[PDB]
């Protein structure tokens, strides 16, 4: 009861961190595509 | 110390959960190791060699390709504007 | 509680999206440049790969060479990809001399001429 | 149109501000950690003080009565 | 001196400001890495070591407390 | 604008000087502790006591 | 007595779980900070890549 | 002077002053930590306990 | 109680599955991603 | 267009201030490295003291076994 | 939407 | 023209290779024809 409550915040911050990491990796993928295009032109 | 079967099932499930817990912790660490080619390894783990040490290495010279063209065009425009304002102010 | 279920679902969605990411592989010209600057033997291998020295006799028998214009054409007079590229470039230069703007993509891929004959070659 | 370097400096300064904020947060966390450790260890100087006092006391007693025997 | 070269010098100042900003950013990032990855973990290790200290000597502590009412 | 820049210069100079003082004092205080701990306080555990009852 | 022992085992494993999850969260936070630094320094490359799209892009045209 | 860069530099100055205060606090805490470590951990506890242990070791080694 | 134990069990099954998925993703997909980015 | 020498002076003063900040940040980096090394040294000394003091727990366990 | 260094500690 | 030779699947050399020599993509190979009027 209260002990699963003691856990649940930790999984909550884990979820927040994972979502942020996912978004960061999508942005990094955009940057990667930009780098590839610049490489090809040059 | 005898325990109920449900409690024992809870306990060994807890054990397995702790096992893959420290497994995941080790995996996340290994990602965070900046020990690329420092420890025994040949793969890049996200670290300055993927960041400012590397991306900034790119950036201190990418300006020579992109921003310098603009800068030159802007400098010509600025010189033209200087000539125009000088002629306009002095002629009148 | 339901918050645990929501967190688990959000994490699963994040992981599924994370797996589906695709990072673009290197293109055609990056390979040429990097393998031609990779290793001392690699530079020679890439120079051999990219540019060949054809048999001058075969080329002369198959291509008229104009030293006055320093141009190359087929001996049979058949138009090739070089002729298309040169004609396109000359046409665009003529249009530029008439004040028309240039093409925003400068390097135009000769898709049509290559395709119309290469697809038949693949059929054959 | 506009000076090309303006946006570059804007972004660079923005990132500098961000990482300096990161530095401030990190050093604040470090300060909290150090405060915690000092308060926790506030028993150790007590321990050391009484140990030193006991050592000095037994040495002084071995001086008062001459039971201090030669070293080995 | 020169006019083309004086515009060149203005552009020099622009380039130097940019590169100095880049160096400053790199230095501050290195400082952040040093603080987060090295200093704080060593402080935590020292904390654990001192806790082991005070744990190992607790038998003396409880003796001294029992008779000194400290 | 110069006010802000010289203010930052003064602040970071203060930080650097304070760190100079702290590092020097820390080194001076650590030298004797290192001297004592590295030499005399060395301890090697070669054995573990074992009741023969378990044996 | 058995229930008490069950509880104390629970507390032990839960506190070690708490510290391990602390470590995991700190590692992920540091990784995210580094990644966002990478993104922040990289975002400027999109403009220059877009400018160089005018020379050669390939499939787009 | 660009107003945007003006505000950026003002924010930079504020953050650096905050950094200076935090570093001053860190220096105090590190001085206290050094005092607790060198004088107490090894200076009094370590020295006295090591002295006792080596004395007992010598006594019982000569009593081999 | 018994129902509390049952709900704890199914929640733990969910936790195990979710963190196994997270571990697999972090071990497989991310290193190759970062390696490709570094190569580029 | 606005006075050139005014922009020149502003840029020069910005440049000198920026160079000062860069050198000062390098000094800060060196100081951080030195501070970390000192913390390492004192942690080593503390861990040596811990290795020394584990003997008391060993003694207590020995007496309990012998009892 | 920028992560901040938050070292968690204890419970 | 080399952009037409290689299908989308051939670009996945090295790390990009879909792991359930390879003739890595190169631009269409050129022959150098002498034009200066000599042999």
Residue numbers in the entry:
A (entry chain I): 57 to 98
B (entry chain N): 3 to 94
C (entry chain O): 2 to 125
D (entry chain Y): 1 to 72
E (entry chain b): 1 to 70
F (entry chain d): 1 to 55
G (entry chain L): 15 to 75
H (entry chain c): 1 to 64
Paper text:
Here we describe the cryo-electron microscopy structure of the budding yeast outer kinetochore Ndc80 and Dam1 ring complexes assembled onto microtubules.
The intermediate resolution of the cryo-EM map and the incompatible symmetries between the 16 protomers of the Dam1cRing and the 13 protofilament microtubule necessitated a divide and consolidate strategy for structure determination. Additionally, we resolved a ‘staple’ density located at the inter-Dam1cProtomer interfaces that was truncated from C. thermophilum Dam1 (38). The staple bridges the Dam1 and Dad1 subunits of Dam1cProtomerA with the Ask1 and Dad4 subunits of Dam1cProtomerB. Binding to Dam1cProtomerB is mediated by a salt bridge between Arg22 of Dad4B and Glu16 of Dam1Staple, as well as packing of Dam1Staple residues Tyr17, Leu19, and Ile21 against Ask1B and Dad4B. Serine 20 of Dam1Staple, a target of Aurora B kinase, is buried at the interprotomer interface close to Leu39, Asn40 and Asn43 of the Dad1 subunit of Dam1cProtomerA.
